[PDB]
Every structure is written in structure tokens, then in C-alpha cells.
């Protein structure tokens, strides 16, 4: 509350650290369904079903241009990528598995880096 603050967590490396995590996600061999926006003209259903499309390139641009106020807003867009994946893809599919794998991979790096 007013004039009463928890001790200041160092957040000065968060930008760089999220960038590294994002790089590692971009270079994972199962990143391919997630690298670019899903083509809304070419994938029937996507536009209507998926309210908030998200992909790694869009996260990369948002990061590089200061559109993430903090590391939680960044983690939310990353999770959104995998949540959309689950909404549109069967678990037993190449894309569906890639989603599960990438989410696991992300959540580990996230915990090891920040918790």
C-alpha cells in the first residue's frame, strides 16, 4: 500500500532472458506449427473459432518493440499459442503433439530461469 513496498525484485534482465527463451523455442524442431501466424484465408474455422491468434513471430515483434509490460504478459502470449493449439488440434496429431511438447519445454525454461 501507500509508502509500503515489498523489496525490489531485479527485473533488469527480464527482457534479455525472455528473448533467450523465445530463441530456444524458435529453434526447437517442433516449433514449425507455431513460427508464423496461421493463415486465416487458408485454414477454414480458424478465424471464427480462435479469438486471439498468437504465434512466435508475433511474440518476437511484440518483444522487440516494447509491447510486453512485464514477464507475465510475455508468458501469457506464449501459453496462448499452446492453448489455441489445443483448441483446434486433436491431441493425437503431429501439431497437437508439437503443442504439448513445446509447452512442456517452455514451462521448464520458465521455472528454471525465473522461479
Residues 6+ apart with CB under 8 A from 62: 68, 77
Three cell numbers at 8? 525490489
Nearest residue to 79 via CA among 7, 3, 21: 21
Q: Look up the domain containing 9 and give its range.
A: 1-115
Q: Which residues of 78-105 are buried (b: 16+ CB within 10 A; e: fewer)?
A: bebbbbbbeebbeeeeeebbbbeebbeb
Q: Per the structure, how many domains does the chain have?
A: 1
Q: How many CB atoms lie within 10 A of CB 60?
A: 16
CATH number at 10 reads 1.20.920.10
Experimental method: X-ray
Handedness of CA 90, 96, 100, 101 (dihedral sign): positive
Amino acid at each position: 500500500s501507500m509508502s509500503v513496498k515489498k523489496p525490489k525484485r531485479d527485473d533488469s534482465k527480464d527482457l534479455a532472458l525472455c528473448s533467450m527463451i523465445l530463441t530456444e523455442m524458435e529453434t526447437h524442431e517442433d516449433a514449425w506449427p507455431f513460427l508464423l501466424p496461421v493463415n486465416l484465408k487458408l485454414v477454414p474455422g480458424y478465424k471464427k473459432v480462435i479469438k486471439k491468434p498468437m504465434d512466435f513471430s508475433t511474440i518476437r515483434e511484440k518483444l522487440s518493440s516494447g509491447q510486453y509490460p512485464n514477464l507475465e504478459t510475455f508468458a501469457l502470449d506464449v501459453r496462448l499459442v499452446f492453448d489455441n493449439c489445443e483448441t483446434f488440434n486433436e491431441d493425437d496429431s503431429d501439431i497437437g503433439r508439437a503443442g504439448h511438447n513445446m509447452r512442456k519445454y517452455f514451462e521448464k525454461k520458465w521455472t528454471d530461469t525465473f522461479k
